[PDB]
Design a binder for this molecule. Structure first.
Ligand SMILES: [Mg+2]
Length: 863
RNA sequence: CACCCGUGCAAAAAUGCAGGGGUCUAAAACGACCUGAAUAUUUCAGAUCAA
């Protein structure tokens, strides 16, 4: 399944002039040089400790055999022969868009006869892609509830507040909209950016810097998503030119987590440090703290080259720590067991690790990789056994009371040089994305930073290569941001420590308790006068608050609820849970082992029988079922009573209602996140082809103005009077549409599109108006087979409700008509408005055709 | 079981075999991370969360 070349230690194969070079795997993403090649003449490089020897060489292929771990012998192809097999016969390749020179011409100053510079640039374009996604999901959480879109840094608050007294209609409404923003309750969900702790309490920031926050991410969107022809295209890459109003707020928010961690570190982590001093009698306590700091905070147990937990999961599988006795003590155990291994492999077992890394690289099946983890595990279990049970028997409740109530004094002399830098040292770029992440979910943060560290590390490893070979590495004066890529990399690794750890929660307000019951269900006949009394009994205007805690612990403190209110609007959500099919599609994707865990709690005999009873249990759910919570809140969930058995029964139902509906809204906005990428790349590629001598035109009026110019076709009077021919395909403007089949099919689809529906298709995906109004659009559908179908029903029904009183054509009305007969998405209508990116073909196919969309749920092509 | 490319065979414009691709997609290898229903600087529960 996996490539034999990269198991033998081959990393890449570069082309320079007539010469050909070759690389190999080093430390992580470091690049080690190996044999160069000139027409069957190979000079070896790195004579000391080579990874693989090439045994046979020729013009069209390079054989190899590896020296590390599992010996693998493989084959490798020549770049210079690419596109030259059966037809000058040796020349550098070019990208499938035929756009290599203009990119080299822009970042760097000149064209090169290499392929090393272009592998670099396609990683720079991949961070603007990922930055173009999450900046859009951020603004939507603010915009959900024109102001946000036209927004820049040259308008400081002293200049913006002048528009209060303005006589103009726009400037007056622009400011009056700002006051309507800060005068909203929903900012409590964004407390990390909008609140500060200061008798003492937690309140909003000064009104000056709230503007500075949203102004700063508001241009991030308008920059990433657009081309920005002018001198503002270098905004993100020139952040040292900002006003002082923006730099200061970044420092204020970047320094509040570190001061929560490293101000007092010994006292809140006082338990684990004591429980370790017991096993490592011989070690000096001061350096142990240094290790436990850089283990826990900096996560240096996640850059080792292998996975510590997969070893952990295999060694203590059936050793008796999976009981319910070890539930609260569990994370205390895994934090330490992962440390005992980390200090093992760092100092004494360093050689046993390098063997593991060079083994997993040279593994061609997953059954091999899974075995070696289980091989090394039994060695670890017989070695680290008494130290483990010496930990578990120390975590027995009462012992933690004594260890938390105890006096200790330890020198921070060693530790204070491993601390995290404050905001005064790090750059504005790393501080910017931190601010951004505080408008996002959990799984979205990791995908952002984890993607960026790889793309900078990949950018690094090419720059050192081109130093070793004597090439022009100097960026142009405007893209000098990347010459310090070694710096911005490490800043992001520090950021991956505490971006996910610290979250500052607010004491719940009244309005949250209304959103908590609206999402959960309110009876029909109840009026506005009555619901404000329902919570008046919750908040007790003797005082019993057992119900206030139920609605705060099981609902508000859930990471699920914190997501649904950001991207949703809670009353739209309960109205959406009345779609039994979609709700049932989310249940039958869950394993039956989870279902039998939920069911046995919520019931007091097959899978699909249980799965129906959980559906209709969701469709009937109300706050009034939980108004009796004052009686059983105080009960402990683990005891054996009636209140406890009732309590967990009432808990899991909420945990199921929210968990199910977290998944639906998550997959749909992630599916939405792949089309914003597509319209980014359309305005990206348009300026590039236009610079290459081609003539496209304007695109904000017609999004199909590019892919026609790629073909060489046009419309004369609103439509295409040109027919199919092969002179166009062979004479296309990129390597994709040189083929005559997909040239033809896109032309067929493209002649039945229209200009108006496409320009609306952008404003529906880039603004997320499709799931902003989800219940209106998802009223009735027969079935749900995948999240691709569902999203493509909504965005079609959003266009029916938009094009209901307007002019349309025969092709559009025939598609909308097939949307009413069959209550689902018209497959031939997906690929009409999804035409504007046909100049890229494998993108067009993956987004228009199920089975090719998601790499985890594969299918079949159309043919 | 998607796209492109090199090779060997049968061909005569395209098909079988065996492989490669960071320069093809959300998408190179280990790893991190996601799919995922499974939060982590803090043992749990309870209590403390709008006047
Ligand atoms: Mg790529």
């Amino acid at each position: 399944t996996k490539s034999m070349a990269k198991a033998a230690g081959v990393k890449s194969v570069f082309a320079v002039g007539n010469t050909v070079y070759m690389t190999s795997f080093g430390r992580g993403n470091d690049a080690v040089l190996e044999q160069k090649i000139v027409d069957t003449s190979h000079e070896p490089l790195n004579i000391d400790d080579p990874a693989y020897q090439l045994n046979v060489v020729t013009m069209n292929g390079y054989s190899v055999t590896g020296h590390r771990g599992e010996t693998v012998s493989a084959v490798t192809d020549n770049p210079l022969r690419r596109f030259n097999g059966r037809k000058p016969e040796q020349s550098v390749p070019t990208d499938m868009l035929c756009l290599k020179p203009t990119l080299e011409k822009k970042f760097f100053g000149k064209e090169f006869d290499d392929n090393i510079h272009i592998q670099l640039i396609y990683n720079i374009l991949d961070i603007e892609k990922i930055l173009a996604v999450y900046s859009t999901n951020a603004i939507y959480a603010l915009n959900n509830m024109d102001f946000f879109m036209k927004r820049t840094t040259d308008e400081t608050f002293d200049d913006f507040e002048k528009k209060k007294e303005s006589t103009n209609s726009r400037e007056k409404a622009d400011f009056d909209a700002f006051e309507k923003f800060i005068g909203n309750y929903r900012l409590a969900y964004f407390a990390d950016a909008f609140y500060v702790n200061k008798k003492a309490k937690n309140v909003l920031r000064e009104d000056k810097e709230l503007y500075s926050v949203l102004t700063l991410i508001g241009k991030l969107r308008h920059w990433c998503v657009h081309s920005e022809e002018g001198r503002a295209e270098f905004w993100l890459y020139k952040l040292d030119e900002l006003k002082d109003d923006f730099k200061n707020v970044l420092d204020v928010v970047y320094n509040r987590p570190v001061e929560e961690i490293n101000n007092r570190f010994i006292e809140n982590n006082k338990v684990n440090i004591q429980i370790l001093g017991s096993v490592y009698k011989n070690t000096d306590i001061a350096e142990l703290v240094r290790s436990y700091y850089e283990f826990l905070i900096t996560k240096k147990y996640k850059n080792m080259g292998f996975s510590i937990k997969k070893l952990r999961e295999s060694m203590l599988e059936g050793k008796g720590y999976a009981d319910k006795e070890y539930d609260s003590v569990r994370n205390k155990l895994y934090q330490m067991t992962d440390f005992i291994l980390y200090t093992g492999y760092i100092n004494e077992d360093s050689d046993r690790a390098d063997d593991l890394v060079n083994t997993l690289r040279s593994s061609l099946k997953e059954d091999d990789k899974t075995t070696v983890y289980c091989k090394e595990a039994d060695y670890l279990w017989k070695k680290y056994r008494e130290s483990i049970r010496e930990v578990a028997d120390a975590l027995d409740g009462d012992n933690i009371k004594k260890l938390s109530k105890s006096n200790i004094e330890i020198q921070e002399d060693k530790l204070r040089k491993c601390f995290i830098s404050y905001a005064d040292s790090v750059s504005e770029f790393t501080k910017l994305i931190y601010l951004l992440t505080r408008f996002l979910s959990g799984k979205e943060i990791n995908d952002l930073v984890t993607t960026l560290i790889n793309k900078f590390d990949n950018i690094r490893s090419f720059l050192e290569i081109m130093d070793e070979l004597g090439l022009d590495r100097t960026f142009t004066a405007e893209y000098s941001f990347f010459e310090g890529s070694t710096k911005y990399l490490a800043e992001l690794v520090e950021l991956n420590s505490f971006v996910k750890s610290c979250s500052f929660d607010i004491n719940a307000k009244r309005t949250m308790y209304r959103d908590a019951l609206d999402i959960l269900g309110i009876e029909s006949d109840k009026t506005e006068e009555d619901i404000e009394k329902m919570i008046d009994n919750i908040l007790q205007i003797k005082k019993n608050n057992g119900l206030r805690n139920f609605i705060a612990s099981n609902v508000i403190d859930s990471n699920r609820f914190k997501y649904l209110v950001r991207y949703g609007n809670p009353k739209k959500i309960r109205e959406t849970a009345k779609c039994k099919p979609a709700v049932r599609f989310v249940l039958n994707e869950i394993p039956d082992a989870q279902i039998e865990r939920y069911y046995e709690a919520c019931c007091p005999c097959s899978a699909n029988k249980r799965r129906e009873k959980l559906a209709d249990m969701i469709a009937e759910i109300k706050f009034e079922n939980f108004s009796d919570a004052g009686n059983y809140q105080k009960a402990n969930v683990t005891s054996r009573t009636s209140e406890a058995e009732i309590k967990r029964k009432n808990q899991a139902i909420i945990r199921l209602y929210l968990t199910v509906m977290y998944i639906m809204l998550k997959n749909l906005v992630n599916v939405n996140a792949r089309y914003v990428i597509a319209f980014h790349c359309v305005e990206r590629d348009t300026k590039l082809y236009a610079e290459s001598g081609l003539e496209v035109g304007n695109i904000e009026k017609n999004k199909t103005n590019l892919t026609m110019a790629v073909m060489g076709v046009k419309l004369e009077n609103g439509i295409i009077k040109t027919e199919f021919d092969k002179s166009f395909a062979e004479n296309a403007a990129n390597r994709y549409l040189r083929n005559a089949r997909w040239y033809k099919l896109i032309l067929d689809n493209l002649k039945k599109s229209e200009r108006a529906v496409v320009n609306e298709f952008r404003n529906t995906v880039c603004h997320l108006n499709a799931i902003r109004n989800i219940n209106i659009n998802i009223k009735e559908i027969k079935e749900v087979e995948n999240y691709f179908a569902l999203y493509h029903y909504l965005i079609q029904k959003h266009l029916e409700n938009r094009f209901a009183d307007k002019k349309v054509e025969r092709d559009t009305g025939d598609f909308i008509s097939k949307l009413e007969e069959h209550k689902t998405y018209c497959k031939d209508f997906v690929k009409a408005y999804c035409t504007p990116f046909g100049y890229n073909l494998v993108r067009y196919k993956n987004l228009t055709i199920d089975g090719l969309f998601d790499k985890n749920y594969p299918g079949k092509d159309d043919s």
